[PDB]
Amino acid sequence: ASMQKLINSVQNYAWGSKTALTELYGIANPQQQPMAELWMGAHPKSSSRITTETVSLRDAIEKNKTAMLGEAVANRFGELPFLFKVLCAAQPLSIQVHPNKRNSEIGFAKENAAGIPMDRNYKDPNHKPELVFALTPFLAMNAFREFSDIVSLLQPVAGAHSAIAHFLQVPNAERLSQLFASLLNMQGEEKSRALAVLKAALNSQQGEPWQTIRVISEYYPDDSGLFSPLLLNVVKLNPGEAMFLFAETPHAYLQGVALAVMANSDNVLRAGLTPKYIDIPELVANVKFEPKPAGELLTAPVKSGAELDFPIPVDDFAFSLHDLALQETSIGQHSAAILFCVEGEAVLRKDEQRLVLKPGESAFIGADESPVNASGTGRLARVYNKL
């Protein structure tokens, strides 16, 4: 078959919503398990499957790389270079940073030399560029706030810690770095003091990011990450909006449902909202302490015919949305593609074959099977490579 409907995995991580996937797409969950992530791709741990008998998408690609991926992706990556997910965050997730490519390679080589098997921040030598696209209103943190914004936010908790006072004396990148590390490094009475002052300020301060801090404290009451919304931009993505997560930039998924597309990596440098040990010097060596203005946080899409492209500044993946109507639209690429029904209903056509996609269902299109003709109502999301 030319268009392959995907059989996808649902990760039942503790933080997932028990209802979102059911409410959105009619996905069954008779025992009310948390359903955190719906995986669309060829990940070795849990590959999407296709019906021929079902076979692993990963194994199918590996048997015919050039035909499935196209020559460009095949020669550059040697595999499907992205993973595509529905993320259903009922609880706040950890604050994360991903090193750039060069440092991810060095980190990988360092840990190989040390002999850490998989207990381990650099499981591979890849970067992890990522894009998030809101399906429901989506609360996140992304990047450092403007210095004067940080200054405005920290003065009501200046007595929490001397590193805060130190930054407020001279609000620059060096002291932002020290404050960042000092906050993550807090211990005992230093930490309880700082956390006591923050909690009290929640009663005298109103609105954002204070409300977000309160939200997070329900799940992470003893975490120094509670200060991060005073350092990092808090963004509330409306459904249809998107944001790219740059290398060396702290970010966190706090609440809601989104599409996430990322290059293939399991590397992560945690920067709070987690019970796990954190290599602070490593984290700091891989963070760029440059403020990002709110005006530059969202990805500005480009609309052309029925196609809404979200420009991505890396080659690892591309992402677009497609308006469906009664009249058909050809959707074509020089790579493999995964098509996902966001809303409405998609009828795909390749020569003789029809494939219907209801919301939340997805299909894999091999490079050699592009293009397809799409019609129906609502919107289809596509992940692919532009190369």
* Of 99, 128, 98, 95, the residue nearest 271 (C-alpha): 95
What type of residue is 9? Answer: S
Residue 193 tokens read as: 């003091």
Q: Is 96 marked within a binding site? A: yes
CATH code at 170?
1.10.441.10
Q: Give the count of beta carbons closer than 10 Å to the beta carbon of residue 187.
A: 8
Which residue segment(s) compose the domain that 320 sits in?
1-6+297-387
Note whether 37 and 136 are same-domain residues.
Answer: yes
Catalytic residue among 49, 58, 145, 270: 270
Of 280, 296, 312, which closes a domain? 296
**CATH code of the domain covering residue 379:** 2.60.120.10
Are residues 201 and 277 located together in one domain of the fold?
Answer: yes
Calculate helix-pair angle for 162-169, 147-154, nearest 10 degrees.
140
Q: Say if residue 174 is in the same domain as residue 244.
A: no
Q: Which amino acid is at 4?
A: Q
Quick one: 258 and 318 in the same domain?
A: no
Residue 58 a catalytic site member = no
Query: Is the four-CA dihedral 123, 129, 131, 132 of positive or negative sign?
Result: positive
Are residues 83 and 182 both part of a single domain? no
Q: Measure Cα distances from 18 to 165, 187, 293 in Å.
A: 43, 35, 35
Count of domains forming the chain: 3
**One domain, residues 200 and 287:** yes
Same domain, 156 and 289: yes
Q: Are 83 and 43 in contact (CB under 8 A)?
A: yes
Looking at the fold, whether 92 and 12 belong to one and the same domain comes out as yes
Indicate the residue among 262, 296, 330 that finishes a domain: 296
Resolution expressed in Å:
2.1
d(CA 293, CA 310): 19
């709110």: which residue's tokens?
Answer: 294
CA nearest neighbour of 209 among 256, 314, 161, 139: 139
Cα 306 vs. chain centroid, distance in angstroms? Answer: 25
Same domain, 307 and 207: no
Contact between residue 299 and residue 131 where contact means Cβ atoms under 8 Å apart: yes
Both tokens of 309, joined, read: 């492209």
- 251 labelled as ligand-binding? yes
Mark whether 317 and 292 lie in a shared domain. Answer: no
For residues 61 and 115, state if they share a domain: yes
Rounded CA gap, 223 and 36, in Å? 22
Is there a contact between 29 and 18 (Cβ–Cβ < 8 Å)?
yes
Same domain, 153 and 139: no
